[PDB]
Design a protein around this ligand. Sequence first.
Ligand SMILES: *[C@@H]1O[C@H](CO)[C@@H](O[C@@H]2O[C@H](CO)[C@@H](O[C@@H]3O[C@H](CO)[C@@H](O)[C@H](O)[C@@H]3O)[C@H](O)[C@H]2NC(C)=O)[C@H](O)[C@H]1NC(C)=O
Ligand SMILES: *[C@@H]1O[C@H](CO)[C@@H](O[C@@H]2O[C@H](CO)[C@@H](O[C@@H]3O[C@H](CO)[C@@H](O)[C@H](O)[C@@H]3O)[C@H](O)[C@H]2NC(C)=O)[C@H](O)[C@H]1NC(C)=O
Ligand SMILES: *[C@@H]1O[C@H](CO)[C@@H](O[C@@H]2O[C@H](CO)[C@@H](O)[C@H](O)[C@H]2NC(C)=O)[C@H](O)[C@H]1NC(C)=O
Ligand SMILES: *[C@@H]1O[C@H](CO)[C@@H](O[C@@H]2O[C@H](CO)[C@@H](O)[C@H](O)[C@H]2NC(C)=O)[C@H](O)[C@H]1NC(C)=O
Ligand SMILES: *[C@@H]1O[C@H](CO)[C@@H](O[C@@H]2O[C@H](CO)[C@@H](O)[C@H](O)[C@H]2NC(C)=O)[C@H](O)[C@H]1NC(C)=O
Ligand SMILES: *[C@@H]1O[C@H](CO)[C@@H](O)[C@H](O)[C@H]1NC(C)=O
Ligand SMILES: *[C@@H]1O[C@H](CO)[C@@H](O)[C@H](O)[C@H]1NC(C)=O
Ligand SMILES: *[C@@H]1O[C@H](CO)[C@@H](O)[C@H](O)[C@H]1NC(C)=O
Ligand SMILES: *[C@@H]1O[C@H](CO)[C@@H](O)[C@H](O)[C@H]1NC(C)=O
Lengths: 97, 133, 273, 97, 35
Amino acid sequence: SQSIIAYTMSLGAENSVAYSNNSIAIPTNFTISVTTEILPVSMTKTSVDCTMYICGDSTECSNLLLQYGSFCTQLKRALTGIAVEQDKNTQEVFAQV
Amino acid sequence: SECVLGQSKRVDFCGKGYHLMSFPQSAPHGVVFLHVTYVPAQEKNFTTAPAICHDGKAHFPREGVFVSNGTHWFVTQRNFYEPQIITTDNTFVSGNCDVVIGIVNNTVYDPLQPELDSFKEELDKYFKNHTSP
Amino acid sequence: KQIYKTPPIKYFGGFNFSQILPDPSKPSKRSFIEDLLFNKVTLLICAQKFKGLTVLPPLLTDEMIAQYTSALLAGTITSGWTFGAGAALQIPFAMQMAYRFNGIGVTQNVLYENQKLIANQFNSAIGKIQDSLSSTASALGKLQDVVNHNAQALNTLVKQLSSKFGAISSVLNDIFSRLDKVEAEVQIDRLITGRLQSLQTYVTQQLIRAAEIRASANLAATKMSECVLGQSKRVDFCGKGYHLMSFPQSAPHGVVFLHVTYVPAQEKNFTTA
Amino acid sequence: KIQDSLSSTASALGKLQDVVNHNAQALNTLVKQLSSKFGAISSVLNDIFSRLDKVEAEVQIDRLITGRLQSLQTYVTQQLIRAAEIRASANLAATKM
Amino acid sequence: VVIGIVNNTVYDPLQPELDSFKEELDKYFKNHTSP
Ligand SMILES: *[C@@H]1O[C@H](CO)[C@@H](O[C@@H]2O[C@H](CO)[C@@H](O[C@@H]3O[C@H](CO)[C@@H](O)[C@H](O)[C@@H]3O)[C@H](O)[C@H]2NC(C)=O)[C@H](O)[C@H]1NC(C)=O
Ligand SMILES: *[C@@H]1O[C@H](CO)[C@@H](O[C@@H]2O[C@H](CO)[C@@H](O[C@@H]3O[C@H](CO)[C@@H](O)[C@H](O)[C@@H]3O)[C@H](O)[C@H]2NC(C)=O)[C@H](O)[C@H]1NC(C)=O
Ligand SMILES: *[C@@H]1O[C@H](CO)[C@@H](O[C@@H]2O[C@H](CO)[C@@H](O)[C@H](O)[C@H]2NC(C)=O)[C@H](O)[C@H]1NC(C)=O
Ligand SMILES: *[C@@H]1O[C@H](CO)[C@@H](O[C@@H]2O[C@H](CO)[C@@H](O)[C@H](O)[C@H]2NC(C)=O)[C@H](O)[C@H]1NC(C)=O
Ligand SMILES: *[C@@H]1O[C@H](CO)[C@@H](O[C@@H]2O[C@H](CO)[C@@H](O)[C@H](O)[C@H]2NC(C)=O)[C@H](O)[C@H]1NC(C)=O
Ligand SMILES: *[C@@H]1O[C@H](CO)[C@@H](O)[C@H](O)[C@H]1NC(C)=O
Ligand SMILES: *[C@@H]1O[C@H](CO)[C@@H](O)[C@H](O)[C@H]1NC(C)=O
Ligand SMILES: *[C@@H]1O[C@H](CO)[C@@H](O)[C@H](O)[C@H]1NC(C)=O
Ligand SMILES: *[C@@H]1O[C@H](CO)[C@@H](O)[C@H](O)[C@H]1NC(C)=O
């Protein structure tokens, strides 16, 4: 007795407010509720080797990788910027005292 | 900086409702907040008028809103039912009561009324205590 | 959470909301102001997308977004700002506005004593807005370059596949029927890597652009929480002046606010101690 | 006391300093990159054409054009990231003011 | 101690609440002392 059905979305239970020009509503009571909320603050740090990924354990590949210039220095420079930044994200949240 | 280290006036920022306070909790690669909020419970409707005229002059609530339950009027808090007797301490006067629309008629008893009904009657009792002989 | 609806009587103390409340005569339930907005932003070339460039439809249809906006405007004029923090509580409008004045630093005794003048002064202001929106073609510029940048970027993608990238020809079939297979694999690599780096570039630009719309959907979600569902104490956040209220309106790929603010008029010198 | 504190050390204006350094270090790497070979015979376009016949020289230069062109697309993409961070700090200085 | 203070008269609101009754209580004394 199970199947897959397709329908139309519902925006919520319809309500009507009895607006009038000499009527007010005052609450006679209150309640206290606790609500949770989750927020990411940092992600895993990472580092990558220039050559072992590309020319792993090959002597004839690493020498001709140098003809490509300072390419992987930029990768080391960029990934280090992210890594050192992740220490600031945690140092600005919890370290206010 | 705002929800934990203070109380926030920004609506719908530190929780769904009127904010009270919050508690941090650590978590892997993040933080978790525990917002404590105030939510109004059941309500009852009344009848309201924007100003009250007693001595030909309008009166407005210093803090609060005029309400009635059918017989006589009251002034209460905005977010919690606590009626109080109308008194010159609760109201301030601003002009006559013809320019305003929606004004209604009732009586305002000045806070010196107990300070006179217990004194003027006492003084009248004193006056009758000395005029008779 | 609930879809409120305004009562049949539309006498809100003198204020005239006919321009913003839904209009039943039109087939859609869109106000008068929303009609001018929807006729000022325009969304065979679309049939020249036989290369696989398609456009998916949004989940929320337009006629359902106009119902969210209707409930915002029908629960902010009867219940005031109490509906965003719990149970909606009705309140007369001429009396609710006395609370917005009380939050500025101006006692409530001035609104009643100038109710007729204020109502007319607000009525005329809403009328002038409708002509200003339709005055020039630069009014809706912010919502315009959003749709232009997302269609001008598609044309360059399509026109890019007429280039050769150093190959013999830009047409893929004629390369094979003219060269032996031993070295026809050299030319095609130049043509299959250029066509592939021209598509990786398109994705990367979308990741940048979607991060600047995400930064504006997080500001429209704050303007609606604070300016609309309450009164804001932040100076110069919900309009130039002392804030009073706001009214959302929908628009293609965006939202339009109508901030009502208080501004002091002529002054006079004085001597103080 | 504020006047002396600002002029006390060289790390006071650090936030405005790495902004101008990152925009001058990025240019130097762009200029220094065009001395690389990318696996070609030589790093100069003029001498490649004067040593190899036209049928073969079209292979080496394409290995050099596609490297210099890719090294310039990286520079633009990095600027798009940085311009989206200053835009996030010009929207905070416009709120502080 | 404050700089820029100026001279004027502050009218007691509680005084007419008794001055009008000094117009009454003392008048009653005047209405009772004479006979
Ligand atoms: C609307 O609210 C007013 C204010 O509370 C109500 O008037 C007050 O009602 C109470 C309780 O019924 C009265 O107390 C009783 O008064 C009688 C008078 O003889 C006394 O014998 C009892 O021992 C008790 O004290 C109170 O007097 C009355 N206020 C005045 C000025 O008389 C009113 O009943 C409410 N009406 C409705 C429809 O809810
Ligand atoms: C609230 O109380 C005030 C004063 O207690 C009421 O004002 C009074 O209204 C009556 C009308 O019922 C006025 O009587 C009028 O007298 C003139 C002659 O002066 C006559 O030509 C009219 O036909 C009418 O009979 C009375 O003058 C007026 N009092 C004052 C001081 O102006 C008011 O009506 C009450 N509000 C409500 C809603 O009942
Ligand atoms: C609220 O404003 C609207 C728009 O100005 C008013 O509708 C106009 O009414 C006049 C009077 O008959 C007509 O001449 C206009 O053609 C109407 N305009 C439109 C767009 O329909 C409306 O009457 C106002 N509300 C009240 C209660 O007067
Ligand atoms: C009256 O108010 C004006 C401001 O509107 C004060 O300043 C005068 O008006 C303008 C504004 O600076 C200047 O062109 C005049 O020269 C100003 N007057 C003087 C004397 O400088 C003005 O000072 C005020 N006067 C009094 C008596 O309060
Ligand atoms: C404001 O009023 C006070 C008292 O009413 C003045 O103080 C008096 O000043 C005179 C000099 O003009 C002295 O002779 C009195 O002894 C002072 N009175 C006391 C109690 O010390 C004061 O000078 C006035 N201020 C101005 C600016 O006129
Ligand atoms: C409330 O509105 C009705 C109909 O619009 C009107 O008859 C009545 O006079 C109004 N009440 C007040 C107090 O203005
Ligand atoms: C009335 O006056 C007499 C003195 O003449 C005094 O002893 C008595 O307490 C007074 N009574 C009252 C009720 O004040
Ligand atoms: C205002 O300044 C003038 C000159 O600077 C001075 O003479 C005057 O006393 C000052 N006013 C007050 C109230 O101190
Ligand atoms: C003065 O006293 C007499 C009684 O001795 C009284 O009748 C009269 O009303 C009093 N006058 C006033 C103005 O109270």
